[PDB]
């Protein structure tokens, strides 16, 4: 495995959020400096095919953002780039040229402030489902959920939450069938929502999770079956270290396997690899299928990647940064892992097939999604 450490050249800003859209990995500073990079260039740089001094961003610019909120939210697709501050939101349609697969200029980007909220109402999380085409807004004070259509920003529905249940983070269904929200009062809510935005709370799991006032990055299983629950409360002995609970979608969220974290502060960023990996044991004629999940704590620069079929983490990258990790991301094939931190320093993890095992095709993962339990259809009122 190749690890390349790169301190970014942004002065007095923190890189809070990252997005890997197609062959482009997009970076977002605190004060609005946004740099977008081709992932392939960094891949060749990590394998020393590209020199370090020749590496430059594809399009690096400044968002027209005011002083009212800071940016922690970037999402969207190759057509539209939805960038959200902690009080405002901008969507950038036509940001990437379709024909050349190159980034359009910011003048060619149809910039539009889609929503703005005011203090003390604070945005907690921004999610978008590609399968549903619906953008999800998570809001604090009051606790409400807003659903918005892709490329039109049409308010499809609104889900209002309890005042004591301040939302912290949300989890996207890879099949686009559900959505899972972690709240302030240790309560976990699952919603059955369709393409039209009609929602249905299907499960309410309280005193299960431990949340703190931070920004978190949690992914679901690529087969849409295993629910990771970091900082678990229920079932954990008191005054121990933190733990991550794995809950099965089809088995009513019983605890399957448990991750014993060290005694420090809990994980902040969790990312499943999109690829399903297989190690064929040639001696037994067996093939062990497994996923790889990258996890990182909320205080130190310590990151661990986890094999689902192993009793150990694969390796431990300890004290990589003096600061906390803001965001991590896999590549689309999952053979590259990106990670950003507060100290404006980039860490790219280049993998080979001998590093990871044989990755299964996405048709296999879709077929595994088809075995999962089907929900009753939403009654349209």
């Amino acid at each position: 495995m190749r690890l390349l450490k790169y301190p970014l050249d942004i002065h007095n800003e923190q890189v809070n959020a990252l997005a890997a859209l197609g062959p482009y990995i997009i970076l977002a500073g605190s004060g609005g400096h946004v740099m977008a990079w081709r992932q392939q260039q960094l891949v060749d740089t990590a394998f020393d095919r590209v020199m370090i001094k020749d590496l430059k961003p594809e399009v690096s610019f400044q968002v027209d953002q005011d002083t009212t909120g800071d940016i922690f939210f970037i999402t969207g697709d190759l057509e539209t780039l939805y960038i959200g501050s902690e009080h405002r939101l901008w969507g950038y349609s036509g940001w990437l040229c379709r024909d050349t697969n190159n980034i359009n200029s910011v003048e060619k980007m149809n910039s539009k402030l889609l929503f703005e909220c005011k203090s003390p109402s604070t945005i907690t999380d921004v999610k978008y489902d590609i399968n549903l085409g619906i953008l999800f807004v998570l809001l604090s004070n009051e606790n409400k959920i807003l659903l918005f259509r892709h490329k039109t920003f049409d308010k499809l529905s609104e889900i209002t939450i309890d005042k004591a249940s301040k939302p912290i983070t949300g989890i996207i269904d890879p099949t686009g069938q559900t959505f899972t929200v972690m709240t302030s009062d240790r309560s976990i809510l699952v919603y059955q929502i369709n393409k039209t935005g009609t929602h249905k709370l299907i499960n309410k799991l309280t005193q299960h999770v431990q949340m703190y006032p931070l920004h978190y990055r949690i992914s679901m299983s690529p087969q849409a079956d295993i629910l990771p629950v970091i900082n678990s409360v229920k079932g954990v002995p008191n005054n121990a270290t933190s733990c991550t609970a794995l809950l099965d979608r089809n088995n009513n969220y019983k605890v399957t396997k448990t991750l014993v974290t060290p005694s420090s502060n809990g994980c902040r960023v969790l990312v499943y690899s999109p690829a399903f990996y297989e190690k064929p044991n040639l001696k037994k004629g067996t093939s062990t299928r497994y996923n790889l999940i990258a996890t990182s704590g909320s205080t130190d620069g310590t990151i661990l990647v986890w094999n689902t079929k192993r009793m150990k983490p694969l390796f431990n990258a300890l004290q990589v940064s003096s600061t906390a990790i803001n965001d991590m991301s896999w590549s689309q094939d999952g053979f590259t892992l990106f990670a950003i931190s507060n100290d404006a320093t980039l860490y790219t993890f280049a993998f080979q097939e001998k590093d990871l095992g044989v990755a299964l095709p996405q048709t296999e993962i879709k077929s595994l999604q088809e075995v999962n339990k089907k929900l009753p259809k939403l009654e349209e009122p």
């Binding site: 923190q14 800071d70 203090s119 907690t124 604090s140 006032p213 005054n239 270290t241 014993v260 005694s263």
Partner: protein, 705 residues
């Protein structure tokens, strides 16, 4: 400009007209409301004076100015809103201090009551409404929970230590931009210090002020002075716990919280210094305040590093007290976390010296920028406390010109009430210890006493290193000069420092001169055993003297007094010491252990000066005595017993041993009392011819008494 002046004159005229016929209260005081609303925008002292009148007329807020009179137009008291209180308090701050630093400004308590009213109307900052406030408080608690690393100190000195807080940007952001809790906490701390000088201050009063400092700090005001004040509050807490509570020192669990408070004060100071170092255009007043903060942090490091602490604030336990330990079998073991020291001690010594070196550097910088600045002896005093039992005065040429300056500042800034003895005291102690251990060249050491003869006021032959004698005689004459200086210390007012001079007198007379009789004569005035109506130790506490010295120091003096008495084996004065100590429970802590030690020394002195054979009286003599023979000999002895026929030492020792047996748990005084009885009263009558024996002893004691 002119609009505000004409408005002020008109408002004053109308207020005067209303007080002339007592009728401003018509139209619900909305005239007063409007006038208050307009005078909130007019920043001048005349508008301030009319605003004082407005606050006394409306909410009946009496603002005490010496040149001020109530314009009573018969208006009932109202309640001021928080919405009105915030720009009013901001106006009060901006008019009171303007461009002057409120820390450096004299504390006017005229505005203090109304400040408390505004604080009460504001109340605490309500949590659970801002993610910023909750997150910043959580980060603050984390940062206080962080252990102590030397790299953190390096980043403090380079200014790379930051918490990266975000300002909430709320309505009350401008109030903490005014530093409202900073000013209120400053007033609270000034009144606390005034009560501390009167010794009426209490630690429970500080928690509200600490919470106010937290609320000001979590607004991301970038005010390191708030960190300075919070560390100072923790420092004063630590001072109270260390001086006034020996039970917190002895209990390691309370010592954990003391180390926590030390760590919190240190973290506040390090954050303050790194915030100042993060400032680019640092003015001179920032240097003046941060120099003082450097002094406070160095003092706290000296406190936390040394005895009785001995680096407990650098030993770290995890918050999760139980470690899930993986066994080699694949089983998980809960394991208790241990305290782990997070910094080597040499780095701590480096940090202390670096703090004081940068303090001296900034003192030189400030004195170059302000030559009327008055220096402090405290740098030399802290360097001497570094020299305490560490160096031995190896740098004698460098020992000179720092203790020289310390003693010079101490005498030249000595007030008429009580001079600054402590640099000269520590100089005397270091000279004694290093002359006695021979670590120093005596010539320059005694030559520096010619400079310190400003404080000494004795002859120059005392400071001439007259090495034309035997070294012991030179040392003894030096002890005579030190005893002369001790008499000089008796000559000063000595507000609370008589006792340790008497301790040094005893240390001179016993350890060095061999005059145990002179030391006993000195300590008998301090410890009056042979009296009855007095206390054990006379440190002049009839009902007035404060505790703190006699808690531990009186115990230590009684320990040395037991050593003095055991040097000459006097048991009568030891028994009188025990008798006085039974009524001296409130005069010291650990009265039981000191009583046991005094019993041990009394019994050892009685066994040594008079002589005994203990393992014979109980196990051997008592089973071999015939009961009728014992009764006959004891009755003939009780009929025979005369106090004039026995020495007073023997009868008084028997009486004291039986009285202490009645006082304590029996076993400690069975041996001495039975030995005195069977050796001097029973057997000499037997050769001529436990309860029963101690009853006969009681009869003989009733014959003595």
């Amino acid at each position: 400009a002119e609009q505000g002046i004409e408005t002020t004159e008109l408002i004053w005229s109308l207020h005067t007209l209303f007080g002339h016929f007592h009728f401003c209260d018509a139209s619900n005081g909305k005239f007063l409301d409007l006038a208050e609303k307009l005078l909130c925008q007019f920043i001048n002292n005349d508008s301030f004076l009319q605003l004082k009148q407005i606050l006394w007329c409306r909410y009946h807020y009496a603002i005490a100015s010496d040149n001020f009179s109530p314009d009573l137009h018969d208006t009932k008291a109202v309640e001021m809103e928080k919405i009105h209180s915030l720009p009013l308090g901001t106006y009060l701050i901006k008019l009171q201090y303007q461009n002057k630093n409120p820390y450096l400004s004299s504390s006017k308590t005229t505005l203090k009551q109304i400040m408390d009213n505004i604080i009460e109307k504001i109340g605490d900052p309500s949590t659970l409404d801002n993610h910023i406030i909750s997150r910043n408080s959580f980060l603050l608690n984390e940062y206080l929970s962080r252990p102590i690393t030397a790299d953190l100190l390096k980043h403090t000195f380079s200014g790379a230590t930051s918490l990266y807080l975000t300002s909430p940007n709320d309505e009350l952001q401008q109030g903490m931009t005014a530093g409202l809790f900073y000013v209120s906490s400053l007033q609270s701390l000034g009144l606390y210090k005034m009560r501390k000088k009167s010794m009426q201050a209490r630690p429970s009063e500080l928690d509200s002020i600490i919470r106010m400092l937290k609320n000001d700090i979590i607004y991301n005001t970038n005010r390191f002075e708030s960190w300075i004040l919070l560390g100072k509050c923790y420092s004063y807490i630590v001072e109270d716990d260390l001086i006034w509570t020996s039970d917190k020192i002895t209990v390691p669990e309370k010592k954990d919280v003391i180390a926590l408070t030390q760590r919190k004060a240190i973290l506040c100071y390090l954050m303050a210094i790194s915030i100042y170092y993060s400032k680019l255009d640092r003015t001179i007043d920032d240097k003046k305040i941060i120099l003082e903060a450097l002094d406070d942090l160095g003092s706290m490091l000296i406190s936390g590093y040394y005895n009785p602490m001995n680096k407990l604030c650098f030993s770290w336990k995890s918050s999760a007290e139980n470690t899930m330990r993986l066994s080699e079998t694949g089983e998980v073991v809960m394991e208790k976390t241990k305290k782990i020291t997070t910094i080597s001690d040499f780095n701590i010594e480096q940090s202390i010296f670096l703090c004081f070196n940068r303090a001296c550097s900034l003192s030189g910088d400030i004195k170059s920028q302000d030559d009327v600045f008055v220096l402090n002896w405290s740098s030399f005093y802290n360097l001497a406390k570094f020299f305490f039992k560490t160096d031995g005065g190896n740098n004698c040429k460098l020992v000179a010109k720092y203790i020289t300056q310390g003693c010079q500042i101490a005498y030249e800034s000595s007030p008429a009430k009580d001079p600054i003895i402590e640099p000269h005291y520590l100089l005397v102690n270091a000279c004694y210890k290093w002359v006695k251990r021979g670590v120093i060249g005596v010539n320059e050491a005694l030559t520096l006493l010619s400079k310190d003869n400003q404080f000494f006021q004795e002859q120059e032959e005392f400071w001439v290193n007259d090495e034309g004698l035997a070294w012991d005689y030179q040392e003894k004459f030096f002890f005579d000069k030190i005893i002369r200086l001790l008499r000089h210390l008796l000559s000063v007012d000595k507000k609370k420092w008589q006792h340790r001079p008497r301790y040094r007198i005893a240390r001179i007379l016993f350890d060095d001169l061999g005059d145990v009789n002179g030391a006993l004569e000195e300590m008998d005035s301090l410890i009056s055993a042979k009296s009855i109506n007095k206390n054990l130790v006379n440190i002049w506490k009839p009902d007035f003297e404060r505790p703190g010295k006699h808690f531990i120091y009186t115990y230590q003096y009684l320990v040395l007094y037991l050593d003095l008495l055991f040097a000459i084996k006097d048991f009568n004065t030891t028994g009188l010491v025990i008798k006085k100590l039974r009524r001296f429970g409130s005069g010291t802590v650990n009265v039981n252990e000191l009583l046991e030690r005094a019993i041990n020394v009394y019994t050892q002195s009685a066994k040594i000066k008079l002589q005994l054979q203990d393992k014979s009286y109980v196990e051997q003599i008592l089973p071999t005595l015939n009961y009728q023979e014992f009764l006959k000999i004891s009755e003939q002895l009780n009929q025979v017993f005369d106090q004039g026929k026995y020495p007073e030492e023997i009868s008084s020792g028997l009486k004291l041993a039986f009285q202490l047996k009645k006082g304590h748990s029996g076993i400690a005084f069975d041996s001495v009392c039975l030995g005195i009885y069977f050796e001097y009263l029973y057997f000499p009558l037997a050769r001529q011819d436990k309860k029963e024996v101690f009853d006969r002893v009681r009869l003989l004691v009733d014959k003595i008494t």
